[PDB]
Amino acid sequence: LRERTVRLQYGSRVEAVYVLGTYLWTDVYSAAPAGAQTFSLKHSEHVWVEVVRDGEAEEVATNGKQRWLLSPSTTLRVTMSQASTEASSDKVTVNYYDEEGSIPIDQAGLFLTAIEISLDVDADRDGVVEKNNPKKASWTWGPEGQGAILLVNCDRETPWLPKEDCRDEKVYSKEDLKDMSQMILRTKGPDRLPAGYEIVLYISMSDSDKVGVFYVENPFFGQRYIHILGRRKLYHVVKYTGGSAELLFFVEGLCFPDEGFSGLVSIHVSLLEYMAQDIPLTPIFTDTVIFRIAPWIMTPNILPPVSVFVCCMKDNYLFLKEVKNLVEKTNCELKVCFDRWIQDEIAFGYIEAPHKGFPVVLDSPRDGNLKDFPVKELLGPDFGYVTREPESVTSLDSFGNLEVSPPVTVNGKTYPLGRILIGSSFPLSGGRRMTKVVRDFLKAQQVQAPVELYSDWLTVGHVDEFMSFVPIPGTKKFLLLMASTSACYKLFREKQKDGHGEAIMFKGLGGMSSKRITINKILSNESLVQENLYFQRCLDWNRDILKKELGLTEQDIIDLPALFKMDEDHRARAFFPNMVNMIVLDKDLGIPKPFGPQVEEECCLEMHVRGLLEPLGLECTFIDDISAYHKFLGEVHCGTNVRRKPFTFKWWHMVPSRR
Amino acid sequence: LRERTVRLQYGSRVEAVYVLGTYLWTDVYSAAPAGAQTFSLKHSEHVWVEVVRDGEAEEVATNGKQRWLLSPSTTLRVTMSQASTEASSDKVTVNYYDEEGSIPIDQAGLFLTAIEISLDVDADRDGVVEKNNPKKASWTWGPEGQGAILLVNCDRETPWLPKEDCRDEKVYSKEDLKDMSQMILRTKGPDRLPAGYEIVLYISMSDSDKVGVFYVENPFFGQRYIHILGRRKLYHVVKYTGGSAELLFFVEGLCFPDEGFSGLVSIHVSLLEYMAQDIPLTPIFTDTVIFRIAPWIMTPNILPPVSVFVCCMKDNYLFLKEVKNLVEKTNCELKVCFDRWIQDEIAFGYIEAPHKGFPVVLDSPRDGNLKDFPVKELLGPDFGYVTREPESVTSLDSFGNLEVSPPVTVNGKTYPLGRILIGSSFPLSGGRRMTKVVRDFLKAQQVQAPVELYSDWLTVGHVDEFMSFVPIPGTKKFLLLMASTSACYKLFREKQKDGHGEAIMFKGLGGMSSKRITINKILSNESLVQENLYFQRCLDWNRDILKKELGLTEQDIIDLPALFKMDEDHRARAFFPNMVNMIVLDKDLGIPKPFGPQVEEECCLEMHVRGLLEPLGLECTFIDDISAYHKFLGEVHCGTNVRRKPFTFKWWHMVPSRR
């Protein structure tokens, strides 16, 4: 119990509200007539009174005759365990006596109205709002941790509105409330608060753009939703009802954790006392709850697939047919839009709270040269949206440059949600780097602990050009897949030795035929050999940082043959389609068709890749996205992205490193 | 050891630097002629080589004949434990064989130069730079914690320069180096780095305004100081010397922890490899150290006094005489300046690192109406300076409004440095509050965990108007001292009852004589009674928050008689000098002379205060700062501030709550 100072008043009796969970220390000396010697006291049945002399306390009966010497160091401790009702007269009365005679010379009194006031949230994270969790004012990480969680309400309930639900101060439909965390103000007391008191809910100016709080009224003509705290509303005076009462509120987050915002917000209720005109009201009692806003979490390739989103031209038939075929071997749904934007402009992620969770799309920054407008078209009920706006964005801001590992353990530290991977350039290089605003956002989510890789040796500059992850069927394990030019050169040299040097690349692509590219022609190009040795140095630098930061050994890695060509900037583009960027649906892999040299009427790259993957139980389907274009220049014209189930592990059970 | 990828090259031999503390995994397959079957190897004495087949490793002799099948999954692991010298030929050579015959058909080789590179700091916090502390790249709090500490070098070595040492990129004198943390780059190797390598120290753009790093050269004409990292210098190419070498650097902090800056900074060294023209150099190896910049720490009244700074008019003689007398009972030095600025504009604090610490002044923000210019006049050798500049500052930005408690324990949580206290207004009041920039600064130091009190009921608005702390002599304990109007009224009512109602206030102040203020006149003023009842409510609200946030009981508190008068804003100013704002030099207290009612030719306020304090072993000296002015209007014309020894407890041994 918290101790509160309430003094009797020289002359006038004192009337005070007492909040359960506190107790009063009471000065009886200041109220005594000068020259009074001793005091006695009476009290009612529901008021417990102790006389405290220099720290030693003595319980006192309701009607006794006992007297004590008046001293500033002799005081009362006053405690009540139950709220007042209308039938209550709760009081303590003190009588004062002079030296001569046992009849009181004066009297001072304290008239009490006891009320219960508690602002309650689901701090124990079970989805139900418990009564006054002792830990509700704190937020701690881990399995044993406590404190309440809030979703950014970033989806859209109502289609005609252009923006996410949280962009305004209004609630249109009851469905919206299911995305919100419940907060209950529980009170117990008599019919009315005594004169001069009111109960007020409030938030800080700083948090006013992080939350909104709604109350549901049920007036005559239907249910309505009142915005009581949030943008440009810092406080709300609460209408008090007597007896045992509860007021239910619904709380939405407006903003994800970011640079300069930890994700923690607070809401308070105070009992205020009116003093006089032109004087602030005094906060007699204050109760506080904390919320943490849930982070955006990215889903790695190893999580179960739900939906496969695909963008291509209407007429790329082979691609559509083969992708349809692949998805039909799974339980996934196929969604087609008739152009890589679904892959480059969108990162699929999710948010979760004990009471609810939904997928959330992160939308890549607009440059204004290429992407003028944001992509909001996926925004819908229980499909959320978030974006960050930097200046000047480069290709490394594309989300082909954003990947996430499966759960890993590194030097004994666990990353149960995996770690986000972002391509970058060397510190002293003066090269390209993802914009600070996006990097800061990803870092602030904290639970995926991002790692920067080296992508800037590639023309386009995305990590998805050189690496991916696949699960190992029938196990809990996974593999890192790396592009390898050394594997490609070894394979082509073997085929040449075997008498296949005249085997031709790009068979069936009519726009490449005049080039007549053979194994011999590739192996005899000396400058191309040197370029690819250099690109292998770039791959191996990444291999090392991945082994270090993901805790991987060589046993966890498979190398897929790849080949690149250098541009004027000494950066790489694919010579033939990059097989590492593949659709991963559990055991079934859609792999870009390489169009490699035919040996015995089978592509030697396809056969080699099958020989690497199939023994592990992975099933390979090669998907041709380039035939419709008759040639391959290093560009990919289709994109896919897979929306997956969230991790079973709850993010709040993690313990991220101290910042 | 960290694993690094190095492949043999098809055709050409490979030459590489090997950094001790790493090891190489080596691809021998890519270098083999097509159609080669098996391989063998030789190696020199200081190179350890294992053949690894699918995870299983086998040690191999220097000159053996053993062969293994060529496979991509059969590789080498290469490890060196000692640096190369000039007499070293460190190498591994691989021979390739075809199916028919045991004579090698080709050979590939790896020529190695092993070097040691370590960037070392005193992470174990003993003041000496240990060799490669495994924890040097992290910073942890507490007794068991590790990682290196940096002072903001905010003092001034050289008087003609206007600003603090850290405001530039130059070091003028060797004395400055003693404020700096040492960082040693230790290397071991042969006479030169092999062609195409260089060693580079670097920092991030973000940290470039947080640190500077100097190197001392001893050329012909004297010692000089070179700025190698810091503002507008992000990297430095290191001149390599062979054998075992050390380069000593000195590091200074430029900035205190603040909003948006945790206090942590990093410095790196990398071994870079030259690839070609117009291509970035590759970071072959990188080593990192972290520093935490030491927080500004405020000294509470219970710490041993060193120097007493005093500001008054030349002619306030009684004050000077009495302050001189008081300080002469102690071992303290008295410093006088011939006006409260030393009290209002200055907060005495300190910084500490394992190798050094000094006092540091925090200078109150300039408004431009009253304080136009900063006070730098105390800036000197081992006396540092820091300030923050907000807009719009109010009286609550004055450091009379900044106090710090003695060490306390609250709900089982220890605050070994005490907690900073700042006066404020109620959240919904629209009242005054210390500027955000200063509040953010104090919060960011973290080790004093600030608490806001309610000062805005006072005209001036400072916590030093109503409260202070004193040690209890002969113990480890302390008392909170609170102004009390209830104590004053009780005392005056007793004196009136005793026949003293005609006793006069302000005796000897000629400018007050016409007012003829008596106990009777004070007690019969009904509006003044109501005002002071209200001010006691304000004091008691503070009493409650102090008991809660400092873990205090009523036994820890003494109430000194005080009286206030209300202004137009319903704010308080002292009716007679506030005794709570006192000079605390251990057992000896300089207490403002109250000029209370004389009873038997002694001030009844002085006698009462002595009766409260003297039994505890505290010695009271009443100090008259107002007689020189002939009257008291509520304003104080002198100021003092005491510079104290720092806490014995080291701040880095604390474990502050997670942010």
Ligand SMILES: [Ca+2]
């Ligand atoms: Ca619950």
Ligand SMILES: [Ca+2]
């Ligand atoms: Ca809304």
Ligand SMILES: [Ca+2]
């Ligand atoms: Ca919603």
Ligand SMILES: [Ca+2]
């Ligand atoms: Ca929803």
Ligand SMILES: [Ca+2]
């Ligand atoms: Ca050391």
Ligand SMILES: [Ca+2]
């Ligand atoms: Ca300097």
Ligand SMILES: [Ca+2]
């Ligand atoms: Ca210095």
Ligand SMILES: [Ca+2]
């Ligand atoms: Ca110095």
